[PDB]
Design a protein around this ligand. Structure first.
Ligand SMILES: Nc1ncnc2c1ncn2[C@@H]1O[C@H](COP(=O)(O)OP(=O)(O)OP(=O)(O)O)[C@@H](O)[C@H]1O
Ligand SMILES: [Mg+2]
Lengths: 240, 240, 96, 238, 234, 239, 232, 209, 250
């Protein structure tokens, strides 16, 4: 199935495939964490888990959520250093767009620019294609909430319910089963579904100190991170 | 085989092998610990004497990055000195550009990005030094950060690097460092380094201690000689 | 326990091998082998044995019963410098 | 063994091999010794020649009136580094108008030699510099290596068969703290004579000497004026 | 099975340089002797066919009015070194207005021997070190001086040198016929005797060439008129 | 900006790229050349006419300048660039020192270029061997031969290409003073040497002669027939 | 930094370029597509399929307008398509700046093919993995063209690409002619796309583009549903 | 030892046949394509048995043809991979120059791709003579045409000179092919003589496909 | 980095260099082209390959390209490199005209293109051009001319030549039947028709499967014509009837 240096760099194998890129997809799973994103009628929610195995480590600096812009938020999975570098590039690109065009940048253009930047690594034979994923949420005028996803191969898309990480398949299956019912979506319902998805996929029944939640809505488009108290409030309201 | 010769080849299971080899190069360094107090941090390094010819004070492993920032290194000395130089130049550049002393959350990030830039391409090799940055400011308290050669930096309440890192952190966790001022911490640091590295492994060694915090009004410097004398005099009592 | 190494003969080895391999033939009384040793810098004992046999064959070729120095010169100029596209020593001195 | 053909490749044990081979290369040169007293720094070198009809190779180089060096390895890289040292010291003398302290110079050499050990298709420098100097803090002895890792020492000896000299220097360390040049040089020569077979020792044609002091400029002695120093040595015990 | 141009050996050696060192055992032999009277240089030619023009090939070529050079090994690439030495001596004369010493020329030309490289440079010299061995003779302020250079870049002063394919035998014979109170005539006679003893073809007045330099006159090259006089009385 | 070593030293001390180039030369067409007191004659063989060629576009003898000519053996792709560079350099020498270029100067220039071209980065060595003939100023006819490693020489009579050893063996036993007494006798000597080589039956020879007076004089396939006939008749009469 | 500066595409002992063949093999596994022209305009039809209901089918598009009267569709790799689209847009812009006229179709095809060819000879790179279809309407006569990873191009009356392209070409052989209208062309395009389509064809799994002498545009899902009905 | 190399179809096996006819010793022939077996360790066994048979008879001649066929083509029927080829090679090298007393056996080898086989197999002391067979020259072309139509009832109209340069670089086998094909074509029409047009069509039939 | 290199410039032990050889083996397949001249006018004949039932047939030319007012050229091999080379020599001709204000002679243009083509076989480390092509033209220096190129770099003048897959048979038949200085632009067409009939396996010579281009001279025009499909058919049938008559004679 292989002949020559197709296993070591990015050139076509005889069947028409290339493996140096689909190796990154399984390099994603090295972190062992999962994140979920849900879009509602007028809001968008990002939820993830966090694990602190030792008491000596300072728990205030292990967040995977990042504020790309006052209106656009993101979550990362995979190797940490690559995710940090991609965050840096995204910040610079958004600021440059604001400088050049005089108005705020749409989320889809930002995702496209990032994917186009990432596509070069799988074209030349001297670089390594950065095994880290990408999820962005934002609010757009005349469109409402928007949730987009980007991958190391350069394939970006726009979803309604997404999961990234170890448990991607069954979480997507559960989300599909829930969304086929076609019920009305409000803020509390979206947050409850997002939390219960992870809760039933992992079967933990966790505490208000082991997850992180970010939310955006059309009342204050600023990206905000929920404080532990109100997270506990949703958690207890979920359990009747 | 051959998947572990370049730094641009993912192995079939999806991970990079050269960086792991750099890690294994680090694990043979001696030891270095650092813990933060109520109003500062304290570093501690045990330095082995290879032969009697060398002079005291040779090849210090406790570097002074900036006027209020200190560094402790472990690994290969040459790469450590290069990293110290690049961090020093970066800090001076920041002070010239903006106009005040750089915070840790920015300097540590910049050095981490520069280190991570050397793990993608096949024309350069990954670094081989793991190091710690410490500081104290009146408006921000005490700050401690640790950076590894793979390009990852975290914040800690107390950390150890070298051969017996886990053995040291075992007695590190027993301490209630959250409360006391770091005037009595020197004695316990001396005690915790004299309880490792059995005399069977090596004959003699020496202690190097740093100091920064509000006690010094922001300056970073070596401890006075008499204080270290008293500290080691106290630490010798573990023979009981 | 021991790792004896066999390397290509330097200069005395070449003259000594010539003397051993040519001491049982009908040759002229005043030939000097040191020059022949100087003419083949890096070579093995096998090529020297081949040199001797080929010089003898050149003498037999025409009619004579005793070889001369010209025969040895032609043998060296044919088995060392013309059969050089077919040697193993350039790639086995790196042991590959 | 494919982990042996470049300076970029990391071994499974985390040991690059090209640096180790350069450290192997530096051991092929002739032995040399260096040491310091309270107010002087003295280094001694043993020369070598191929045939009896050829002059002995020169080992001690003059860097500046307060800095001298001794080499071991291959001569081309040694000359390149010596030229760089000359240039840096002259530039410092020109700008700030003051001698360059030894420590800063050694740090500059260390930062310079580290660069080739990281790029692609670049080799390290094979040299064994021993640096002797005098400064505001007094005498100074330094040793470098091809791995861009300098050491600060009070007495050292490197080259081929340097171990016995190191043993002698180590067991006679304290006596260096009080004596003056007259017997300090004799101690250095006694150490150097230890690394030779039992046939030939010192005949004034194979030994060079270099001194720097508080009020004495860097001075080199070779083959004619060494006789005053060489006389007064007891015979090698049998 | 491929290694870079600069690569160290398990024992401390460089690969390209060792090969170049052993590749000069294919060239002609050449002998140089130094005496307080002057410096003598002699070399063979190794004519292959009767249709040669023996005057076309030459080994001894003068660098300046008082410095001569003899080359052995390959000959194609020694021209660059010779031209560099010429230009450098002329530049020193132009700037300082004097004649530069032999040792300075040798150490100035030896700096260029080991600059071959494959990465991070302009074309320069791609790989091969030079593959020539050079003998320098001259008369400077401290008398007559002879120097010998090596493809590794190491130069050293000698008193009697022989380089080429017949190096070791000529050196062994030369060690026992030399003293420090020679004259030029006996030096020339000894060099001729050695060359006759080791050379393959019969010696005559067209197979060899010789040069001598003295403090009095400048670099002088013998011709086919006075060359047979020193031969007939051998 | 392709920079990588092509020519390197073999462990026993040889540069295999240069030897491969020489062996590539050793399978070209044969070329021969001799000089007299006033006429210098050089010829080529193995024309192998396919009665469909335009002979003016395949000539292997080119005129560098008024008093110099050159014939090459090897692969023809690399010849014309060396031709062009030599023409430009020899014309450039005219704007400086006013005297015309001697044959020695241009031969040294070509040899130096060839040698330098085996030292740079990412360049394979040239693959041709050349004979340069000329009657320089003051009337001293001479010829030189250049090699792919960059070593030129001065000879009296040369043969390069396929089957050169036999031609050289024939020439070194036949080149005599009286054999060069007459112009037609020298041309007959060249024709005899070529005919004693690869078959080349009278219709596969192209010769050119300089008389140290004017430009090249390429001779049509008519005088060649007369010379061949006279040589054959003399050979028959001798037998 | 620096690249490699040596070609990764070389000649085999049998006189063939291997990498181009492997790129064509990768192209053959893409989504199917069809293209027809009949005397009045051109029709481009392509099939799209989201993996699950979670994907938003109105977020991205397959058919993309280079300018007011040029259309382009692809078959093969996904990410490589956008680079070519962007380059084509740039090239049209320089042409219009210089000549102050809309670019003719043939010139654009030639320039794009030149770029794609140049991308297989330079150093340290690998060729693109897509096959393109380009359509336009200039000076009355409609034009249709097809590119190739090797850089060559052809002019066609009817073309099928992607999976089972041989069956599509044979089917078009027995159906197409030289005198129809855009509506019948649409009908036969949907008919031939139904050969390898899914079980049920909805108004959102298919993208259709039409060019006439009024300009290029992409059909909205409503009329696509109208065309899907009353047929098959 | 003696080895013969050159381009294909130039007369190596023919010289071997002539030696076999003239000689008086027992003659053993084996092709290289059958030195590779389908199990493990069978190849060395076969080599050992071959030289044992050649040794135990008498003064003899061993002829091995197309050796390079073991290094060029690979077969899936081989149980091992490429290493058992190496084991067979090591066995052959031992048999040529082992430390046992060889006796009285002569070895002749022949191939047309000599730039691939192992240089340790051809060193002096194992193979001492190397003979190159070049392409035929036009004098030899005329001589070959004279040989191969010696007993053919050839008509007077034909001329060999025209056929000599029919192809620029034709080898020895093309001559025999052309002659035999012309003979067959004349045989079809129940004739005895051979005309020009027969040769003219025969060359097109044999050369231009 | 030196592990992944292919070394597309070095020599070989046997003297030759492989890449140009492999390119020449590649030019063996894929097409057939030939050229002939003996008097006023020179003709090129090409075998069309793309003969599928669905081709729009635009651009008025398949393989014949115009390079100047009086220069035309065919091509065989990979078509993309053909586009590159044709575009490359077009501006060479134009820049010569710009500098000298005189139509460029054919020989100089061919030599310039061959120099560019040879540049890739000595340094750079890139894959060579796998294209060989013909040239036909007229100039005041030597009247009418035909030339042939080569991926190796060399060239040469000719009187009648073929390049395609069956070039051997075409060359043999050409050298068997030709006359020097008599063939007008009436017999050359018949000769080319017969040669193509022999080389291609398909009989009856479908008129859509061949392409003919002729160059003739006028007072000041030097007209290049691509004769249409309305004149090939009677030429073919005339060849057929005369061949049948000649065979019936025997
Ligand atoms: N020099 C020659 N003299 C006579 N006949 C010859 C000669 N060369 C070739 N032939 C003819 O060609 C035939 C081919 O011979 P043979 O197969 O032995 O050649 P080969 O070159 O050794 O073959 P291979 O390389 O394919 O093993 C011979 O049988 C003979 O008919
Ligand atoms: Mg055979």
């Amino acid at each position: 199935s292989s002949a020559g240096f197709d296993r070591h760099i990015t050139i076509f194998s005889p069947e028409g495939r290339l493996y140096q890129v689909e190796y990154a997809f399984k390099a994603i799973n090295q972190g062992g964490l999962t994140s979920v994103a849900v879009r509602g009628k007028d809001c968008a929610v990002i939820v993830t888990q966090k694990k602190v195995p030792d008491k000596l480590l300072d728990s205030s600096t292990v967040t995977h959520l990042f504020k790309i812009t006052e209106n656009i938020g993101c979550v990362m999975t995979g190797m940490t250093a690559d995710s940090r570098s991609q965050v840096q590039r995204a910040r610079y690109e958004a600021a440059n767009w604001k400088y050049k065009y005089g108005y705020e940048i749409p989320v889809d253009m930002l995702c496209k620019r990032i994917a186009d930047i990432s596509q070069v690594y799988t074209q030349n034979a001297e670089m390594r294609p950065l095994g880290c994923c990408m999820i962005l949420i934002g609010i757009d005028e005349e469109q409402g909430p928007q949730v987009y996803k980007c991958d190391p191969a350069g394939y970006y898309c726009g979803f309604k319910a997404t999961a990234a990480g170890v448990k991607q398949t069954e979480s997507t299956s559960f989300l599909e089963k829930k969304v086929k019912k076609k019920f009305d979506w409000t803020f509390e319902q979206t947050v409850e579904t997002a939390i219960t998805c992870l809760s039933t996929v992992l079967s933990i029944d966790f505490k208000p100190s082991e997850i992180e939640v970010g939310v955006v809505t059309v009342e204050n488009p600023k990206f905000r991170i929920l404080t532990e108290a109100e997270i506990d409030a949703h958690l207890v309201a979920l359990a009747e | 085989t051959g998947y572990d010769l370049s730094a641009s080849t993912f192995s079939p299971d999806g991970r990079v092998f050269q960086v792991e080899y750099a890690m294994k190069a680090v694990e043979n360094s001696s030891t270095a610990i650092g813990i933060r107090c109520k109003d500062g941090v304290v570093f501690g390094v045990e330095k082995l004497v290879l032969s009697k010819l060398y002079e005291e004070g040779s090849n210090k492993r406790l570097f002074n990055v900036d006027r209020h920032v200190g560094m402790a290194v472990a690994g290969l000395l040459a790469d450590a000195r290069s990293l110290a130089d690049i961090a020093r130049e970066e800090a001076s550049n920041f002070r010239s550009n903006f106009g005040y002393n750089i915070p840790l959350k920015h300097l540590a990030d910049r050095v981490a990005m520069y280190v991570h830039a050397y793990t993608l391409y096949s024309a350069v090799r990954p670094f081989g030094c793991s190091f710690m940055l410490g500081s104290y400011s009146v408006n921000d308290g005490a700050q401690l950060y640790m950076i590894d050669p793979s390009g990852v930096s975290y914040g800690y309440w107390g950390c150890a690097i070298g051969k017996a890192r886990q053995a040291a952190k075992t007695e590190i966790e027993k301490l209630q460092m959250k409360e006391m001022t770091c005037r009595d911490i020197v004695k316990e640091v001396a005690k915790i380094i004299y309880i490792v590295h059995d005399e069977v492994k090596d004959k003699a060694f020496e202690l190097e201690l740093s100091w920064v915090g509000e006690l010094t009004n922001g300056r970073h410097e070596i401890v006075p000689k008499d204080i270290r004398e008293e500290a080691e005099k106290y630490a010798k009592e573990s023979l009981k | 326990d021991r790792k004896i190494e066999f390397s290509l003969p330097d200069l005395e080895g070449r003259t000594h091998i010539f003397k051993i391999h040519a001491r049982s033939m009908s040759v002229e009384r005043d030939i000097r082998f040191e020059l022949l040793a100087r003419l083949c810098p890096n070579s093995t004992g096998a090529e020297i044995r081949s040199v001797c046999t080929e010089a003898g064959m050149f003498a037999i070729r025409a009619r004579r019963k005793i070889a001369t120095e010209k025969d040895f010169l032609e043998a060296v100029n044919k088995v060392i410098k013309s059969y050089a596209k077919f040697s193993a020593t350039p790639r086995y001195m790196t042991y590959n | 063994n494919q982990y042996d053909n470049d300076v970029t490749v990391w071994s499974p044990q985390g040991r690059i091999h090209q640096i180790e081979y350069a450290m192997e290369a530096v051991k092929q040169g002739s032995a040399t010794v260096g040491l310091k007293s309270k107010t002087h720094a003295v280094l001694v070198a043993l020369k070598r020649a191929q045939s009896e009809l050829a002059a002995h190779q020169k080992k001690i180089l003059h860097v500046d009136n307060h800095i001298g060096i001794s080499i071991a390895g291959l001569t081309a890289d040694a000359r390149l580094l010596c030229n760089f040292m000359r240039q840096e010291c002259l530039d410092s003398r020109f700008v700030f108008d003051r001698p360059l302290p030894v420590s800063r110079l050694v740090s500059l050499i260390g930062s310079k030699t580290q660069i080739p050990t990281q790029r692609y298709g670049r080799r390290p420098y094979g040299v064994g510099l021993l640096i002797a100097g005098y400064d505001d803090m007094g005498p100074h002895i330094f040793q470098t290596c091809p791995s861009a890792n300098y050491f600060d020492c009070r007495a050292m000896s490197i080259g081929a068969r340097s171990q016995s000299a190191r043993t002698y220097l180590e067991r006679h360390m304290s006596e260096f703290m009080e004596c003056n040049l007259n017997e300090l040089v004799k101690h250095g020569l006694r150490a150097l004579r230890e690394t030779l077979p039992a046939e030939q020792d010192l005949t004034t044609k194979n030994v060079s000497i270099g001194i720097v002091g508080k009020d004495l400029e860097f001075t080199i002695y070779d083959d004619d004026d060494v006789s005053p120093f060489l006389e007064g040595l007891e015979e090698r015990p049998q | 099975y491929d290694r870079g141009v600069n690569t160290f050996s398990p024992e401390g050696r460089l690969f390209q340089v060792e090969y170049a060192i052993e590749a000069i055992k294919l060239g002609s032999t050449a002998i140089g002797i130094q005496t307080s009277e002057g410096v003598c240089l002699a070399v063979e030619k190794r004519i292959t066919s009767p249709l040669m023009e023996p005057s076309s090939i030459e080994k001894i070529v003068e660098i300046d009015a008082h410095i001569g050079c003899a080359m052995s090994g390959l000959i194609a690439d020694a021209k660059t070194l010779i031209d560099k030495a010429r230009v450098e001596t002329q530049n020193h004369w132009f700037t300082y207005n004097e004649t530069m010493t032999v040792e300075s020329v040798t150490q100035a030309v030896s700096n260029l021997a080991l600059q071959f490289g494959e990465e991070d440079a302009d074309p320069g010299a791609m790989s091969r070190p030079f593959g020539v061995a050079l003998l320098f003779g001259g008369v400077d302020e401290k008398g007559p001086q002879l120097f010998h250079m090596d493809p590794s870049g190491t130069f050293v002063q000698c008193d009697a040198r022989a380089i080429g394919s017949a190096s070791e035998g000529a050196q062994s014979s030369l060690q026992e016929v030399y003293h420090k109170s020679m004259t030029l005539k006996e030096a020339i006679k000894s060099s001729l005797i050695i060359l006759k003893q080791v050379m393959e073809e019969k010696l005559n007045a067209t197979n060899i060439e010789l040069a001598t330099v003295q403090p009095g006159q400048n670099f002088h090259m013998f011709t086919k008129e006075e060359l047979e006089e020193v031969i007939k009385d051998i | 900006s392709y920079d990588r070593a092509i020519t390197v030293f073999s462990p026993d001390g040889h540069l295999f790229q240069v030897e491969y180039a020489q062996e590539a030369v050793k399978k070209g067409s044969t070329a021969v050349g001799v000089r007299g007191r006033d006429i210098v004659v050089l010829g080529v063989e193995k024309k192998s006419v396919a009665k469909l060629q335009d002979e003016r576009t395949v000539r292997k003898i080119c005129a560098l300048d008024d008093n110099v000519c050159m014939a090459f053996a090897g692969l023809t792709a690399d010849a014309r660039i060396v031709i062009n560079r030599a023409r430009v350099e020899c014309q450039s020498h005219r704007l400086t020192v006013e005297d015309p270029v001697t044959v020695e100067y241009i031969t040294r220039y070509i040899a130096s270029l060839k040698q330098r071209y085996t030292q740079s980065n990412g360049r394979r060595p040239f693959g041709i061997s050349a004979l340069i003939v000329g009657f320089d100023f003051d009337g001293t006819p001479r010829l030189y031969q250049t090699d792919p490693s960059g070593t030129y020489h001065a000879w009296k009579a040369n043969a390069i290409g396929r089957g050169a050893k036999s031609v050289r063996e024939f020439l070194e036993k036949n080149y005599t003073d009286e054999a060069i007494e007459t112009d037609d006798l020298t041309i007959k000597l060249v024709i005899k040497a070529l005919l004693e080589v690869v078959q080349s039956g009278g219709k596969n020879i192209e010769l050119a002669v300089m008389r140290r007076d004017q430009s090249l004089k390429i001779l049509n396939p008519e005088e060649i027939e007369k010379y061949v006939a006279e040589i054959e008749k003399e050979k028959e009469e001798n037998e | 930094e620096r690249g490699y500066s040596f070609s990764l595409t070389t000649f085999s002992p049998s006189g063939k370029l291997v990498q181009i063949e492997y790129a064509l093999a990768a192209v053959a596994g893409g989504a199917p597509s069809v293209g027809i022209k009949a005397a009045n305009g051109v029709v481009l039809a392509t099939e799209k399929k989201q993996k699950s209901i979670l994907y938003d089918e109105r977020s991205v598009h397959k058919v993309e307008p280079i300018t007011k009267h040029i259309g382009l569709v692809y078959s093969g790799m996904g990410p490589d398509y956008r680079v070519l689209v962007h380059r084509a847009r740039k090239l049209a812009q320089q042409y219009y700046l210089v000549y102050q006229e809309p670019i003719p179709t043939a010139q654009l095809v030639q320039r794009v093919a030149s770029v794609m060819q140049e991308y297989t000879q330079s150093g340290g790179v690998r060729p693109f993995g897509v096959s393109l279809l380009i359509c336009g309407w200039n000076e009355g006569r409609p034009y249709l063209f097809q590119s190739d990873p090797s850089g060559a191009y052809f002019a066609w009356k009817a073309t099928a690409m992607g999976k089972n392209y041989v069956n599509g070409k044979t089917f078009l052989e027995k159906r197409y002619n030289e005198d129809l209208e855009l509506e019948d062309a649409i009908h036969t395009a949907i008919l031939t796309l139904k050969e390898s389509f899914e079980g049920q064809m909805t108004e959102d799994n298919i993208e259709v583009g039409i060019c006439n002498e009024a300009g290029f545009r992409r059909l909205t899902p409503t009329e696509v549903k109208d065309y899907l009905a009353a047929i098959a | 030892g003696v080895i013969l190399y050159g381009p294909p179809g130039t007369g190596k096996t023919l010289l071997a046949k002539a030696v076999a006819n003239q000689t008086s010793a027992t003659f053993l022939r084996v092709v290289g394509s059958e030195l590779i077996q389908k199990y493990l360790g069978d190849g060395p066994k076969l080599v050992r048995e071959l030289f044992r048979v050649a040794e135990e008879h008498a003064p003899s001649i061993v002829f091995i043809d197309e050796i390079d066929a073991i290094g060029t083509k690979r077969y899936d029927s081989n149980s091992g991979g490429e290493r058992e080829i190496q084991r067979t090679m090591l066995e052959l090298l031992n048999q040529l120059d082992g430390f046992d007393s060889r006796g009285d056996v002569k070895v002749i080898m022949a191939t047309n791709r000599i730039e691939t086989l192992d240089p340790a197999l051809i060193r002096p002391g194992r193979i001492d003579r190397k003979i190159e067979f070049p392409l035929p020259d036009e004098k030899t072309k005329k001589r070959i045409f004279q040989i191969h139509t010696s007993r053919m009832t050839l008509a007077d109209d034909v001329t060999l000179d025209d056929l000599i340069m029919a192809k620029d670089d034709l080898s020895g086998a093309d001559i025999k092919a052309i002659c035999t094909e012309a003979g067959l074509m004349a045989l079809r029409e129940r004739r005895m003589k051979v005309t020009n047009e027969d040769f003219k069509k025969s060359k097109e039939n044999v050369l231009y496909k | 980095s030196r592990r992944y290199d292919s070394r597309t410039t070095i020599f070989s032990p046997e003297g030759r260099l492989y890449q140009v050889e492999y390119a020449m083996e590649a030019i063996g397949h894929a097409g057939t082209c030939l050229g002939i001249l003996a008097n006023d006018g020179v003709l090129l004949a090409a075998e069309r390959r793309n003969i599928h039932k669905l081709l729009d047939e635009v651009f008025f030319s398949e393989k014949i390209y115009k390079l100047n007012e009086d220069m035309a050229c065919s091509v065989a091999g990979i078509t993309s490199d053909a586009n590159v080379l044709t575009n490359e020599l077009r501006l060479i001709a134009q820049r010569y005209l710009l500098q000298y204000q005189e139509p460029i002679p054919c020989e100089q243009l061919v030599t310039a293109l061959c120099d560019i083509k040879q540049a890739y076989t000595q340094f750079g480390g890139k894959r060579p051009f796998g294209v060989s092509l013909l040239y036909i033209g007229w100039d005041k220096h030597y009247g009418f001319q035909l030339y042939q190129s080569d991926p190796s770099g060399n060239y040469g003048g000719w009187k009648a030549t073929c390049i395609g897959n069956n070039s051997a048979a075409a060359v043999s038949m050409l050298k068997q039947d030709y006359k020097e200085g008599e063939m007008t632009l009436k017999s050359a067409l018949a000769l080319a028709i017969k040669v193509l009939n022999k080389t291609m396996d398909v009989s009856k010579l479908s008129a859509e499967k061949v392409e003919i281009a002729t160059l003739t001279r006028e007072n000041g025009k030097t007209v290049i014509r691509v004769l249409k499909q309305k004149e090939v058919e009677q030429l073919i049938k005339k060849h057929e009837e005369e061949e049948a008559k000649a065979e019936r004679e025997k």
